[PDB]
Design a protein around this ligand. Sequence first.
Ligand SMILES: Cc1ncsc1-c1ccc([C@H](CCCN2CCC(c3ccc4c(c3)n(C3CCCC3)c3nc(=O)c5c(Br)cccc5n43)CC2)NC(=O)[C@@H]2C[C@@H](O)CN2C(=O)[C@@H](NC(=O)C2(F)CC2)C(C)(C)C)cc1
Lengths: 87, 151, 104, 115
Amino acid sequence: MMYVKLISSDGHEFIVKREHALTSGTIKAMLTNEVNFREIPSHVLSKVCMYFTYKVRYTNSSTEIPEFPIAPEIALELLMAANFLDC
Amino acid sequence: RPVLRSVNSREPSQVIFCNRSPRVVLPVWLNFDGEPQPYPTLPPGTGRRIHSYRGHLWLFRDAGTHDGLLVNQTELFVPSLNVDGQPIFANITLPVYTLKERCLQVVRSLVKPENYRRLDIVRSLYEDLEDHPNVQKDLERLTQERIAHQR
Amino acid sequence: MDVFLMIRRHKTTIFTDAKESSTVFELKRIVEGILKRPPDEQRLYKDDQLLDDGKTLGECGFTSQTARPQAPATVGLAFRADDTFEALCIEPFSSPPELPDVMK
Amino acid sequence: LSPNPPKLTKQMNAIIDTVINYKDSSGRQLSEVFIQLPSRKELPEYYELIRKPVDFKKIKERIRNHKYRSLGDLEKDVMLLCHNAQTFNLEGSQIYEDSIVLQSVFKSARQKIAK
Ligand SMILES: Cc1ncsc1-c1ccc([C@H](CCCN2CCC(c3ccc4c(c3)n(C3CCCC3)c3nc(=O)c5c(Br)cccc5n43)CC2)NC(=O)[C@@H]2C[C@@H](O)CN2C(=O)[C@@H](NC(=O)C2(F)CC2)C(C)(C)C)cc1
């Protein structure tokens, strides 16, 4: 029931469970319950938050694992974000 | 001589290779010298009864990209004894990849390897894209993990 | 089974999950624990259709096939200013750049 | 190389065709595993224990190229194939029991040709 707030470069606020946000080693290091991302835009940060949910829901579970989808137009910025966030 | 190899047994083993992943699966048998031998592929969401032997070693990959897949929640599969007309199940599934590895997969599928250097990304990510999923490098790591585990 | 959602109002997005059998009011109680506004001061929308407190998330059209962890379904949220309800406003996210030549 | 009389080749192919096509009561073709030997690259221990390896593909190849000069020479190689099957594999294994039946099928098929 503990939540954290992740802010995108354009000012979007993403409220996610603290457990889910700890998926990122960088966020885990920075944590406090708020982190601002000066170089991650909302369209990438929302996708990163979808990954945190996906990882936590399916890590060590037998309820068939689906593919994590990535549209071609977001792939490059999402790769840059994944590398910076360490997840 | 290589630790990861099939046992030269003669007791047959009927196994069901069940592909519960969205990928086209390449089954890979490690021969008696631990060399990986590719076998016929498995379409997504299908099961096939195959003839193998006790102590034989298998791993499973994406037939197109060689991305590593899981079998019974792990990396290697070994058929056991058929307990009174009962085929063994090798449950092939999609791992939960890291967001970084999943992104590298998607960028590799979209860009030719000769063009990786033309992408506007940091220097270290070019090396990451070029470090393609490889069965031999994964066998080198699994051999090192076994050497550590038993110490 | 579980439904995975994005509760959206202005530039705020809450990632939460709930049971398909749970109600619209139980979801307003989750919003109360985070945004500190009681359920009576909230209106919830699937696209632009207002949702009833006693209706389940399943009955609203949020199911495990349409509300997945990797692709959550959006729930619009509007609050009550004084005694009148504000018009539903969800600010969009940014747009990705144009696809590079080598990716096309 | 010297060509065999057509009647002897006709007999040799009829005997081996009976052996190769033979099916059990469950419809299973018993010669299947015996058609091709596994390569020495994939199973070298077979070639270490079996001094003179032979499979049915080689026997058909020996009839066609007139290597066997009599029905006794064909029988010698079929009995060698079955003897090798019984040497490499253990008693009770399906392959060991399949080789004995094919051996008996060869002998009845040959006795049919003898009238
Ligand atoms: C469809 C699909 N979709 C996704 S994956 C897939 C799929 C497709 C095809 C298959 C085939 C399926 C065919 C299996 N079959 C291969 C040939 C083998 C063979 C063939 C001829 C033999 C013989 C054994 N043996 C014996 C029986 C056991 C020991 C050797 C024997 N003894 C004789 O004496 C003999 C003679 Br007189 C004449 C001619 C042949 C003879 N043969 C029997 C099993 N299966 C295999 O290839 C399996 C898998 C892996 O475990 C290795 N493997 C083997 O069979 C190995 N064999 C052995 O280790 C041993 F034989 C005990 C020593 C090798 C060395 C041949 C590679 C499976 C999955």
